[PDB]
Amino acid sequence: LAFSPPFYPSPWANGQGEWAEAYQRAVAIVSQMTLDEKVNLTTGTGWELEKCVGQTGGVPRLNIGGMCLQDSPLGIRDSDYNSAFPAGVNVAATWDKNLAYLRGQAMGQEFSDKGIDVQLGPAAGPLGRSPDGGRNWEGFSPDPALTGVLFAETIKGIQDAGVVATAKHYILNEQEHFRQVAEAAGYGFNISDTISSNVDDKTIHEMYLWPFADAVRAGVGAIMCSYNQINNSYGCQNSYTLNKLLKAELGFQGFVMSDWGAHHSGVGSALAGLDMSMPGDITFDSATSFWGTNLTIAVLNGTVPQWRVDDMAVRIMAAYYKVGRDRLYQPPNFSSWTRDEYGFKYFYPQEGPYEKVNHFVNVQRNHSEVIRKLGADSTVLLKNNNALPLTGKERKVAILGEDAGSNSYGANGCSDRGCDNGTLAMAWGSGTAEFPYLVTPEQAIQAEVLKHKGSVYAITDNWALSQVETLAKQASVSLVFVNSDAGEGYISVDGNEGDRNNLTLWKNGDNLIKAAANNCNNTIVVIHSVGPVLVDEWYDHPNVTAILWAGLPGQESGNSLADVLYGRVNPGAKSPFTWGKTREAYGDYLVRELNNGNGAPQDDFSEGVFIDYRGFDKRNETPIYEFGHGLSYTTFNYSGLHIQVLNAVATETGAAPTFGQVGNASDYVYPEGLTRISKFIYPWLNSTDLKASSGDPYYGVDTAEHVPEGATDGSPQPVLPAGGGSGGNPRLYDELIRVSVTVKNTGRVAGDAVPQLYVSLGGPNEPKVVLRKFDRLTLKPSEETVWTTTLTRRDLSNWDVAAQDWVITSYPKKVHVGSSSRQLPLHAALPKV
Amino acid sequence: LAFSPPFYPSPWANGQGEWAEAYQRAVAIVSQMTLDEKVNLTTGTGWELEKCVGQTGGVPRLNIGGMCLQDSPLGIRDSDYNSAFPAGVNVAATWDKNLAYLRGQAMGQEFSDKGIDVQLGPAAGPLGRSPDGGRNWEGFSPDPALTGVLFAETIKGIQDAGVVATAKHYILNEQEHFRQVAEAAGYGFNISDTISSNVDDKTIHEMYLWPFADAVRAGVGAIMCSYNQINNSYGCQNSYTLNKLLKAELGFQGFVMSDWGAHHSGVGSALAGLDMSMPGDITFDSATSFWGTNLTIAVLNGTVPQWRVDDMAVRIMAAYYKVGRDRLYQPPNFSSWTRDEYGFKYFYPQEGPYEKVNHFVNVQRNHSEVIRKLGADSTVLLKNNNALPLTGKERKVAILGEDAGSNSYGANGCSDRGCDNGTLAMAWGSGTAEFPYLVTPEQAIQAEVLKHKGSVYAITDNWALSQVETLAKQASVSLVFVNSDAGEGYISVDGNEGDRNNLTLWKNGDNLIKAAANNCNNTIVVIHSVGPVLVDEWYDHPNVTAILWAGLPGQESGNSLADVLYGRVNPGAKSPFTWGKTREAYGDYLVRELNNGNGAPQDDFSEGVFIDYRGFDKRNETPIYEFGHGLSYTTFNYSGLHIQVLNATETGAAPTFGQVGNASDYVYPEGLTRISKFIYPWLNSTDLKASSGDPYYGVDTAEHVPEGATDGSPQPVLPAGGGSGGNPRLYDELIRVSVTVKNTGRVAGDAVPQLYVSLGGPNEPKVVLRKFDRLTLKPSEETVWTTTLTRRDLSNWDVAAQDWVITSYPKKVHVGSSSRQLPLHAALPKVQ
Numbered sequence A: 001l002a003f004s005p006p007f008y009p010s011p012w013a014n015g016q017g018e019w020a021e022a023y024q025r026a027v028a029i030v031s032q033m034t035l036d037e038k039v040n041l042t043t044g045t046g047w048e049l050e051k052c053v054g055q056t057g058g059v060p061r062l063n064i065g066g067m068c069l070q071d072s073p074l075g076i077r078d079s080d081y082n083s084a085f086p087a088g089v090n091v092a093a094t095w096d097k098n099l100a101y102l103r104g105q106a107m108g109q110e111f112s113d114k115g116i117d118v119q120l121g122p123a124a125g126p127l128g129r130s131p132d133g134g135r136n137w138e139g140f141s142p143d144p145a146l147t148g149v150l151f152a153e154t155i156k157g158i159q160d161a162g163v164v165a166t167a168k169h170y171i172l173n174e175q176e177h178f179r180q181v182a183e184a185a186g187y188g189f190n191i192s193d194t195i196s197s198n199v200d201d202k203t204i205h206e207m208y209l210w211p212f213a214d215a216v217r218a219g220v221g222a223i224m225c226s227y228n229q230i231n232n233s234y235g236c237q238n239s240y241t242l243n244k245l246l247k248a249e250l251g252f253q254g255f256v257m258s259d260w261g262a263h264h265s266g267v268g269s270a271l272a273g274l275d276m277s278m279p280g281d282i283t284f285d286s287a288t289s290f291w292g293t294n295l296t297i298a299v300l301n302g303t304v305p306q307w308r309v310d311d312m313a314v315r316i317m318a319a320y321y322k323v324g325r326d327r328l329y330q331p332p333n334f335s336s337w338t339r340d341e342y343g344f345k346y347f348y349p350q351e352g353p354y355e356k357v358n359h360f361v362n363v364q365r366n367h368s369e370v371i372r373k374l375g376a377d378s379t380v381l382l383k384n385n386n387a388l389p390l391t392g393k394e395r396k397v398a399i400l401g402e403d404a405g406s407n408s409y410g411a412n413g414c415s416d417r418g419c420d421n422g423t424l425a426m427a428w429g430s431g432t433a434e435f436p437y438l439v440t441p442e443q444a445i446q447a448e449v450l451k452h453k454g455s456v457y458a459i460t461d462n463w464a465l466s467q468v469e470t471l472a473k474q475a476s477v478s479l480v481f482v483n484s485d486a487g488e489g490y491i492s493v494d495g496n497e498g499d500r501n502n503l504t505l506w507k508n509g510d511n512l513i514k515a516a517a518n519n520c521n522n523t524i525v526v527i528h529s530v531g532p533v534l535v536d537e538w539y540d541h542p543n544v545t546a547i548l549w550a551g552l553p554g555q556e557s558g559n560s561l562a563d564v565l566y567g568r569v570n571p572g573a574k575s576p577f578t579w580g581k582t583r584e585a586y587g588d589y590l591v592r593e594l595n596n597g598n599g600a601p602q603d604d605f606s607e608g609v610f611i612d613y614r615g616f617d618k619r620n621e622t623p624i625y626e627f628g629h630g631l632s633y634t635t636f637n638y639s640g641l642h643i644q645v646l647n648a649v650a651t652e653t654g655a656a657p658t659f660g661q662v663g664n665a666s667d668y669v670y671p672e673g674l675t676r677i678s679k680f681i682y683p684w685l686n687s688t689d690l691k692a693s694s695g696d697p698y699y700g701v702d703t704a705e706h707v708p709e710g711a712t713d714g715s716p717q718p719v720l721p722a723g724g725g726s727g728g729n730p731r732l733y734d735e736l737i738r739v740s741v742t743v744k745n746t747g748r749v750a751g752d753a754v755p756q757l758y759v760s761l762g763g764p765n766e767p768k769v770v771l772r773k774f775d776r777l778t779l780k781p782s783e784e785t786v787w788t789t790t791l792t793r794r795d796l797s798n799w800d801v802a803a804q805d806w807v808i809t810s811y812p813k814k815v816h817v818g819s820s821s822r823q824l825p826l827h828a829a830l831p832k833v
Numbered sequence B: 001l002a003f004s005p006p007f008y009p010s011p012w013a014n015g016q017g018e019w020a021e022a023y024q025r026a027v028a029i030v031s032q033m034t035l036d037e038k039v040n041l042t043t044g045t046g047w048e049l050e051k052c053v054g055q056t057g058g059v060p061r062l063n064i065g066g067m068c069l070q071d072s073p074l075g076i077r078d079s080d081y082n083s084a085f086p087a088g089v090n091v092a093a094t095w096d097k098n099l100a101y102l103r104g105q106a107m108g109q110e111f112s113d114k115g116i117d118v119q120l121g122p123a124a125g126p127l128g129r130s131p132d133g134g135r136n137w138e139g140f141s142p143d144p145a146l147t148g149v150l151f152a153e154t155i156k157g158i159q160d161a162g163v164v165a166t167a168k169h170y171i172l173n174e175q176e177h178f179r180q181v182a183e184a185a186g187y188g189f190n191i192s193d194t195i196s197s198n199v200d201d202k203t204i205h206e207m208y209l210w211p212f213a214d215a216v217r218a219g220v221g222a223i224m225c226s227y228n229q230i231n232n233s234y235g236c237q238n239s240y241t242l243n244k245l246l247k248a249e250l251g252f253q254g255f256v257m258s259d260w261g262a263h264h265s266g267v268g269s270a271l272a273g274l275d276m277s278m279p280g281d282i283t284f285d286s287a288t289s290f291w292g293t294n295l296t297i298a299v300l301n302g303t304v305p306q307w308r309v310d311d312m313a314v315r316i317m318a319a320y321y322k323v324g325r326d327r328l329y330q331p332p333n334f335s336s337w338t339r340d341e342y343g344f345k346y347f348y349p350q351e352g353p354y355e356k357v358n359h360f361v362n363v364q365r366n367h368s369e370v371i372r373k374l375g376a377d378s379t380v381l382l383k384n385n386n387a388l389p390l391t392g393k394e395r396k397v398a399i400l401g402e403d404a405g406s407n408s409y410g411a412n413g414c415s416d417r418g419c420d421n422g423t424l425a426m427a428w429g430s431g432t433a434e435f436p437y438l439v440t441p442e443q444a445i446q447a448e449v450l451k452h453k454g455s456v457y458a459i460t461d462n463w464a465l466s467q468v469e470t471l472a473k474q475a476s477v478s479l480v481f482v483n484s485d486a487g488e489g490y491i492s493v494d495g496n497e498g499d500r501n502n503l504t505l506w507k508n509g510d511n512l513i514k515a516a517a518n519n520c521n522n523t524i525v526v527i528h529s530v531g532p533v534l535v536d537e538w539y540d541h542p543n544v545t546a547i548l549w550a551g552l553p554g555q556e557s558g559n560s561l562a563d564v565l566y567g568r569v570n571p572g573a574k575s576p577f578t579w580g581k582t583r584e585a586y587g588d589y590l591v592r593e594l595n596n597g598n599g600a601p602q603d604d605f606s607e608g609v610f611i612d613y614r615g616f617d618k619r620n621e622t623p624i625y626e627f628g629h630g631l632s633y634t635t636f637n638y639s640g641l642h643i644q645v646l647n648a649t650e651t652g653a654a655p656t657f658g659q660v661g662n663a664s665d666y667v668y669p670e671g672l673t674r675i676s677k678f679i680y681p682w683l684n685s686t687d688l689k690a691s692s693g694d695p696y697y698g699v700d701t702a703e704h705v706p707e708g709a710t711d712g713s714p715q716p717v718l719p720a721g722g723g724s725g726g727n728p729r730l731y732d733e734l735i736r737v738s739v740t741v742k743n744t745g746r747v748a749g750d751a752v753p754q755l756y757v758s759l760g761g762p763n764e765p766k767v768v769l770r771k772f773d774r775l776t777l778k779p780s781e782e783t784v785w786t787t788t789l790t791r792r793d794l795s796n797w798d799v800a801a802q803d804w805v806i807t808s809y810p811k812k813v814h815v816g817s818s819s820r821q822l823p824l825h826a827a828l829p830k831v832q
Ligand SMILES: *[C@@H]1O[C@H](CO)[C@@H](O[C@@H]2O[C@H](CO)[C@@H](O[C@@H]3O[C@H](CO[C@H]4O[C@H](CO[C@H]5O[C@H](CO)[C@@H](O)[C@H](O)[C@@H]5O[C@H]5O[C@H](CO)[C@@H](O)[C@H](O)[C@@H]5O)[C@@H](O)[C@H](O[C@H]5O[C@H](CO)[C@@H](O)[C@H](O)[C@@H]5O[C@H]5O[C@H](CO)[C@@H](O)[C@H](O)[C@@H]5O)[C@@H]4O)[C@@H](O)[C@H](O[C@H]4O[C@H](CO)[C@@H](O)[C@H](O)[C@@H]4O[C@H]4O[C@H](CO)[C@@H](O)[C@H](O)[C@@H]4O)[C@@H]3O)[C@H](O)[C@H]2NC(C)=O)[C@H](O)[C@H]1NC(C)=O
Pocket: A003, A004, A005, A006, A007, A192, A193, A232, A233, A234, A237, A238, A239, A264, A265, A266, A267, A268, A269, A271, A272, A290, A294, A295, A297, A298, A301, A302, A303, A694, A696, A698, A699, A700, A701, A702, A703, A704, A705, A706, A707, A708
């Protein structure tokens, strides 16, 4: 069975780089704090006890209000008068750094105005190992370079707007099946522990860890560790990924929180590098906690060094100061659990004073504009035989397919979007927000037609094929809508248990397109989906004249598409993953069966770095639409590739500090005038009897055998060769080569080009090409510009498991520039660097 | 069994009144016609043989193209690129003479541009005897005066636009059940003949006939006779309704056509007053006709006199010329039967040249404007507890009801509208038109809210009550949509066989409203429906703050309603029927079971004139919303009632026009390829008997020709006859009535003043509508409304005299805002 090697001690914060000032302030405040106060910062108060999906108790003596953590990566979850933004995958499809930042800011403004301190997003785990993973859509791209840049920009938008961002899920949560014991039990599977992701050290460095290196460098404040195990050690107590990769190598200064139910131990988790327990209890409303009272005790009994807890506190307060949350603080002005104006303060046991729980603050501003624009700029024109744009002179327009119309239960009518009904603008689970409204394509496209006095209808039952065939016959253009949904594992729609069961269009999609294409010579397909779908039955039909993939657009779906359809927006989006002929062509099967008896199912990443396009290229498979493909209403030419060589750190840490003092056990007993709320998780002890007030069956049992070698070592540590900066050693960010190329709009209309820069690092086991740089450049017809980027040391290196460092191998390297991963007209050898 | 007395001979046209020019031109051209050319004018060429729903072969030698007849009373049926107008019942709900006219015009223009010669509408029969009758929505109101005026106005609109209008169905086709033998069989009932409407002579004159008199006087060119019997004589061979009432008493100068399948004999119908057989065959594509060849033979053999068929041809050409159709003529440029560009010229047998059958002509112009307007001005605000108009600032809007949303099969996804899915904008059967698009209330309301930056959702599954309740608890306003549908007999939706099985809201309507109102203190109900529905379970719920009835609005439905909800238009529509507490309160039950063995069911109109309000009032029942009721965003005042007293006996002999030759002149021309199933006027051979193929040919003929049916000599003019729409004497203005109307609220809007009379006597309704108008007033603005009462308006039909008489009982006049809100009344001075 795969094994996860220990790495201890759990590194302490040091005011690294851009954290200097936040660290100073964190230190100065925590120095004043009692141990129980410190513990409060680290532990949620129990599932549904307060306002937010996660909430700590704060430190009221020092005027630090409870921290409020709210989902999701695309807008505020479980609230009102908020926006619903397009999904992370849509951000990926824009290939636009700027839009990523603008969407992050727009979200941080909304979060901030609801009195939420921490956004539970953006996501880059899952990266997208398997095209059928239930949650790829919440993230960006199976490409680490594309994902890391957009991940970082999203994070920067959120944090510049004053809210702590949470990079999740760390790490290797690449599928929904067997991600949680109880969750698998509900589906009839009996396992004792969660799926284990077993990955070699090179692969994790070059793929899954890379966006997280970007996130750390860009200043992310929090990290959420995952439900799965990695080499059979749980994500939220895995010292290798937490202490070694994240904190020692990447130099991460902020705090680590558990996924909700991913916390599996007090002592082990605290020593393996966790900083914060969510929602705070062991299971939802157990009135018990691996931390709270137990963490206070674990410090009093000498098992967890004071310097760990102080470090937990320092990292939490440093992330809070770093985004200036303190300057914006206000209690959450809504409740996640009810929409009522009034309710009991403590929702779950219905206790506390009866008071205002919802203020109905409208936080949307004019964010519909950015959502509308982003939706349009994320619509990938996969195919176009001079079918698009529409002129509005189309005499009779047939809008065909359930995905064009309304959810008959209302846009929000399925709990956490747990259905695929009507147009697909948001996938399901906790990565969701309530729509303020949803503009359907039916609505937007019919309004456009009527504006020009044309005739138009929507048929939205995908087995009404008789009506489809009849109308398609009479139509100038048939616009056919189809979708494929997915989401978090705790919801099953039509037997799809988070992960998709297949990659075929839902609701009779293929049959619908055929019924249309058999009858209109001008049939245009629009796909809303979480990821790639199988297009082989119909994409090359002589009558299917254009095909678009629009992702998950959020509240303005219909308007975003019309802007593209009718040419107000020239599509410039590019596919952020691969469209293959078959499911088999992608490889990377999901583990859908118990393969280690009733133990944790084993998920071996035996493809190594070879996911999505890397894999297709290794196997010499031809995608229908390759990673990086998108058409435009104009054309672009790339020429004049040129390469220019350019002229381009502590060895030990300090010892672990402590801040403030720890007193007697009697200092930490339940204060006397305090009504203890049912299910509420507190940091206090029932009495000075440590064993009895912990109530832990394993209290004091073989204690020293369970504290790992190194785990209590407060002495100065060596700095990893790959470490000592932010997102790695800073030498990895030296710029070694400048690349330039001329990009020209050779067509009739203004448009955005997406230059793409790939390298081949060389070597017998390396992908042919891997993306390194890109930009999105707006160009008027005939306009020319010179696109200039740089390659860093990291960009040209590979992870050397023996050196534990990134190394530029002696294989010769090449640069390639062009319009997709397969359309690379320019190449240049790189000189030795 | 009820019996229908003979009236013969069938009156011939005489260039009466406004017909003098058209008649002269018709006589000039018919005089040049051979017998077979004349017969061609009278007979359709067979079901689905040509382009239109009904089509004659015309007279090519004389440059007269075949006459194309097409549904529907609310827009072109079976075509493309046309408009879908609101139903007749909406026109009624507007109480607006000018809007009825403008709608007629807009339709005429469309029909004209398709190469349609004759529109099969408007409808004032059914009048509306029963609230659950399946085609009431097609017509206007169960009140004869309201219906007569708006029917006439529609006709004038269509005809000034150059298309022949067809007043239908004449007469008493008051329910769908049993209207046809073959339909009754597909529903499991065995009957030998169709339902017989049995009505006394007074009731027919004062109710059912009256709007047909208005039609005739207004100049209607065509009348379509009905599928039902009247006293056990078929509507298309009823000498009493056709020869006496329509032709002799009302002086109709136009032509009468059969409904499709309503022609039941060759000779009997010709002599009983029929002028045109549609679709031309005995049954659909039977390749036989009661006329065509048969009518040629009937003339040649001496059974039908030449003057009768000549008269058919004159009535038909005169109608054509009166509207100016000759100046606007073109062959039909679409096919009712396929949307393809090319096809065989003769659809049913797929024979003839292979050529272009559709030209995709976009006749819509800017008609969407009249439609959107008519829809707004037909939306009756039944209740408003200060809920409306909305301001646009509502924070969160809940749109609730399948009736707000899209038909998931596409607006036209159900053939002849034969379903009730998504918003109800058109009821079903032949009274329909393909939508060019359909704007749903969901689309218009959400677009409105989005324009003000609010939040808004639509839930359109009427059993998703969980989602409905949750959303209603969060909304600033709940807009709840519910409907009830009906249509023509040959279609059945949810076991509603045209007629409604009940007056209850379809698709869980009551439970939906209750589910909303139990949760939003601001629940606003919108009903789309073909007529009244029961509201008593929820109309007075304290959270039900407003109720509107929007009818069948047509293509702009959602924009029509938004315009009203958001105050762009101030509603002035009025209820054109009664909203009762129970189905029992209307009386007038349909005949739903055989009551005469396997003979024709018998439908005794035993209530007489007491339908809708007339009956509610006679039984002192209190309606929830009375006939004439509608609210406004402003208020009005009615005052200062002032009353002021104001200051041919034989026909020609029947003419013949042109000549009849030997049989051999009418044998099939030799060069001519006979299309299968196509109906021609010609004979196989000079053998009359063999050319006819009638098993009864030449058997007992004189005994089957009623006395006088061949009498061509000058006839007495009836006392109630002699003019157009009856004796001119009955249009003398006898009394002038005036009142002052003031807008006393704060919003510009329309008032609908209504004048009712009480004619007095033990058998008369307490109040009967006689005049109305729709007057536009700004806040504080006043106007004088002046109107007159004719001799007809003050009369009752006297059976003994066979005339309209002003009876000696004293009469009153009432003016107000509804049939129950009548603050102004006075005794009328005796007039004679
Ligand atoms: C001061 O106050 C404190 C607060 O009150 C007191 O704290 C308590 O201390 C106790 C010790 O005195 C703790 O109990 C012991 O906990 C351990 C650890 O359990 C957690 O981690 C397990 C995996 O851990 C490895 O990795 C972690 C880091 O992730 C390390 O910290 C561990 O040292 C260990 O490290 C090795 O492995 C990694 C690679 O993974 C390497 O990198 C290292 O190099 C090391 O090689 C994990 O598996 C546990 O998960 C179990 O528990 C979950 C529920 O919590 C459950 O979800 C899982 O499914 C799983 O359940 C199964 O096991 C549990 C009990 O653990 C059963 O209840 C359950 O029903 C299932 O059967 C957990 O997350 C734990 O290993 C200990 O139990 C082992 O040893 C005891 C006997 O001593 C046996 O009875 C158990 O069967 C078990 O034995 C297994 O392993 C043995 C090897 O040691 C082997 O010999 C056996 O064959 C067997 O398979 C104890 O439970 C207690 O957690 C803690 N409480 C709190 C609140 O923090 C403190 O005592 C006090 N001080 C003083 C002085 O009084």
